[PDB]
Each structure stands twice: as C-alpha cells, then as structure tokens.
C-alpha cells in the first residue's frame, strides 16, 4: 500500500525535525489556557504531534498536503511571536530540513503519489491545472487593488473575520488546490472562485469597494474561461475518461 510507505517517509521526516535544536515549543499543541490569547490571534493551530497523528490517520496523500500543514507551524509563529523571533527561526529550521528531505526523496515520492492518485500523472489533468493557474496569476490577480484576495486573511489584522466568514477562500488557496490537482473541471473551480465573492458580500457589504473588486475578479475569470472554452471542454472530457478508467 503506497499510502503506508508514504506515511512512513513523512513520519521519518517528523522524527528528523523533532531532533533539531530548540524545537520543543512546536512538538505539541499550544496550551491555549496558558497562552490565553492564542486562538484570538491564530486560526489554524498546528504542531508536530498533531502532524504525526494526521500522518498516521492517512490524511496526507502527497508531499504537498503534509508540507502545507507543516508550514502552518512557521506561519503561526511568525504571526504570534514575530517574523524574526527565535521561535520563528526555529520553526523555519524544521521546514528547511523537511524541504531537504523531500528533495532527497523526490523520485520515490513522485512514484508513490502517482500510485495513490493516478490523476497526478495524467497529461490532461496537468494541462488543465496549468491553464487554471495561469488564469489566476495572469488575469485574476492582475485585477487592480485585488491584494485583499491574494492570501488568507490574517486574524491578527482583522480580528473578527472568521467569526463572520466561516467558509473562507482566497486566491493563494485556489492556487494550492490547482497545484494539488483538486479541480477536474470548471465547476469546482468556479465554486471556490464564487465563494470569494459571496464572502465579500457577507463581510463587506454588496456596495463595498472590496466587493466591487471581487466582482471584477469573478468577471475576468468568466471572460478568460470563455476564451479557452473549447480546449478546456476537451480537457475536461479526457480527464473524466481517465477518472473512469481508474476504476
Ligand atoms: C481573501 C478574501 C478576503 C477579502 N478581504 C481581505 C481583507 C484584508 C486582507 C489582508 C491580507 S492579510 C495581510 N494576509 O491579512 C493580505 C490578505 N489584509 C487586510 C488588512 C490588513 C491590515 N490592515 C488593513 N486595513 C484594511 C484592510 C487591512 N485586509 C479585508 C479587510 C476588510 N475586509 C476584507 C476582505 O474582505
């Protein structure tokens, strides 16, 4: 079972990062009853013990989902402690070691990832995802003043955001989904794109400048999809065929 082999590699990387100097504050969940404002500032807590338990629950089918959770440890430290705090440097040292190990094992990891999910090697899936990513970076992120939608809201700067928006979305998360080949057709992609606009209507109001920007993001998305409709339709057909053959 390639999921077992993958999980054993990921656990070995956790063992290696746990062994780096001064990393203990990241080995287990923050005690939010001691660090009393922690959840008022941090939205996605993560630590090496939770990461290991997730590896064992088979939650990570690839390098990328594991690395995204590992990166939360660094991002959380940067937000709570500060970008140059020694704790953030320590957490970064674990992410750096992870990247070294993933690089060392990249061919084996690619093979396991392909055995777990054959669509990651499907040329039509790859071409489709490449087009979506180009739409996001060259058209949607090029909308003037679209910066509020490029990355997840940091609760440190907008403290009530996630009490209002419980199903958040942003363009970086969409790009990560594309990189993970989450989207097999335009429908799921447009579900996430439209969630950005719906959340702006809810949080900012229908007449806010934020919402006008989100509307323009959605509109240039539709326009660019229409320009590539015939290629995208063929790719979606061939992806569906690959998905059915994987049965
Ligand atoms: C992705 C969809 C969310 C859309 N969005 C996003 C924001 C937003 C985002 C960001 C980030 S950050 C730096 N990573 O937090 C880059 C994302 N910074 C700030 C910010 C940070 C400090 N002071 C501020 N003064 C006014 C805004 C502001 N604001 C927002 C603020 C009010 N409404 C909305 C809204 O609807």
């Amino acid at each position: 079972d390639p999921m077992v082999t993958l999980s054993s590699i990921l656990e070995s990387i956790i063992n290696d990062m746990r062994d780096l100097p001064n990393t203990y504050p990241f080995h287990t969940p923050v005690n939010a009853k001691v660090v009393k404002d922690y959840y008022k500032i941090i939205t996605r807590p993560m630590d090496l013990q939770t990461l290991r338990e997730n590896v064992r629950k088979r939650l990570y089918p690839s390098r990328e989902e594991f690395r995204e959770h590992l990166e939360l440890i660094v991002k959380n430290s940067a937000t709570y402690n500060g970008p140059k705090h020694s704790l953030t440097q320590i957490s970064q040292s674990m992410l750096d070691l992870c990247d070294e190990k993933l690089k060392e094992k990249e061919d084996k990891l690619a093979r396991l990832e392909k055995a777990i999910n054959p669509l990651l090697d499907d040329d039509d899936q790859v071409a489709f995802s490449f087009i979506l990513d180009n739409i996001v970076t060259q058209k949607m992120m090029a909308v003037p003043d679209s910066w509020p939608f490029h990355h997840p809201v940091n609760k440190k700067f907008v403290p009530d955001y996630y009490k209002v928006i419980v199903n958040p979305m942003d363009l970086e998360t969409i790009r990560k989904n594309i990189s993970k080949h989450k989207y097999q057709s335009r429908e799921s992609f447009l579900d996430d794109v439209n969630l950005i606009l719906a959340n702006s209507v809810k949080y900012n109001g229908p007449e806010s400048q934020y919402t006008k920007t989100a509307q323009e993001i959605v509109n240039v998305c539709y326009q660019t999809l229409t320009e590539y409709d015939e290629h995208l339709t063929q790719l979606e057909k061939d992806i569906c065929t690959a998905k059915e053959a994987a049965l």
Side-chain angles (χ1 to χ4, degrees), residues 147-149 151-154 157-158 161 169-170 200 203-204 210:
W147 65 266
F149 307 98
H151 302 281
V153 170
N154 192 326
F157 303 138
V158 191
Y161 185 75
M169 191 49 57
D170 63 272
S200 185
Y203 187 79
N204 301 306
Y210 289 107

Side-chain angles (χ1 to χ4, degrees), residues 58 132 144 183 238:
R58 305 311 183 229
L132 294 189
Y183 307 115
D238 289 333

Side-chain angles (χ1 to χ4, degrees), residues 165-192:
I165 300 304
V166 296
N167 183 25
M169 191 49 57
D170 63 272
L171 296 174
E172 182 193 355
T173 299
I174 293 179
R175 290 195 73 204
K176 282 181 190 335
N177 288 341
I178 293 164
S179 87
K180 292 177 285 187
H181 300 303
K182 176 199 154 163
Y183 307 115
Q184 278 77 69
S185 79
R186 280 163 280 189
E187 293 67 18
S188 50
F189 171 72
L190 285 173
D191 284 345
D192 284 348

Side-chain angles (χ1 to χ4, degrees), residues 41-235:
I41 291 301
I42 297 304
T43 303
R44 299 182 64 195
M46 182 58 48
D47 67 275
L48 294 186
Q49 174 188 275
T50 299
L51 192 67
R52 186 191 299 280
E53 275 157 9
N54 287 351
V55 170
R56 288 181 182 165
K57 292 181 180 180
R58 305 311 183 229
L59 260 57
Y60 304 128
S62 73
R63 287 166 273 198
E64 174 59 17
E65 282 100 342
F66 171 83
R67 191 188 184 274
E68 287 166 7
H69 275 184
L70 173 61
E71 190 168 20
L72 294 172
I73 301 183
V74 183
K75 291 165 157 274
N76 290 343
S77 184
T79 294
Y80 190 84
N81 300 306
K84 312 286 219 147
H85 195 286
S86 68
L87 289 166
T88 305
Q89 298 191 56
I90 291 156
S91 70
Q92 183 68 48
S93 81
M94 319 181 296
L95 182 57
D96 293 342
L97 184 49
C98 172
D99 288 342
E100 301 165 32
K101 302 295 182 180
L102 296 181
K103 194 198 199 93
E104 286 173 10
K105 311 169 189 288
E106 74 205 302
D107 292 332
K108 184 199 297 199
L109 288 164
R111 292 179 183 276
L112 296 166
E113 283 166 1
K114 293 179 179 179
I116 292 159
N117 178 4
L119 283 189
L120 307 183
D121 199 35
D122 181 275
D123 175 55
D124 296 305
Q125 176 70 73
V126 168
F128 181 78
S129 292
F130 181 68
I131 294 169
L132 294 189
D133 195 63
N134 285 336
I135 296 178
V136 174
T137 61
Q138 310 292 128
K139 298 293 196 93
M140 283 155 92
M141 282 161 75
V143 168
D145 308 320
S146 56
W147 65 266
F149 307 98
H150 288 205
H151 302 281
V153 170
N154 192 326
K155 189 159 67 178
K156 185 179 192 139
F157 303 138
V158 191
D160 78 337
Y161 185 75
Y162 294 102
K163 293 183 182 168
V164 177
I165 300 304
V166 296
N167 183 25
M169 191 49 57
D170 63 272
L171 296 174
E172 182 193 355
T173 299
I174 293 179
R175 290 195 73 204
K176 282 181 190 335
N177 288 341
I178 293 164
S179 87
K180 292 177 285 187
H181 300 303
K182 176 199 154 163
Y183 307 115
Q184 278 77 69
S185 79
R186 280 163 280 189
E187 293 67 18
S188 50
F189 171 72
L190 285 173
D191 284 345
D192 284 348
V193 171
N194 271 280
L195 184 51
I196 299 177
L197 171 59
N199 289 337
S200 185
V201 169
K202 185 169 180 57
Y203 187 79
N204 301 306
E207 305 298 329
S208 168
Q209 180 57 52
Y210 289 107
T211 295
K212 295 175 180 327
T213 297
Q215 186 63 73
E216 200 182 319
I217 291 171
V218 168
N219 284 349
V220 309
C221 183
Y222 291 137
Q223 188 55 48
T224 311
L225 293 176
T226 301
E227 292 175 10
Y228 308 95
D229 175 59
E230 185 178 297
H231 190 194
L232 290 173
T233 294
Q234 186 57 45
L235 290 168

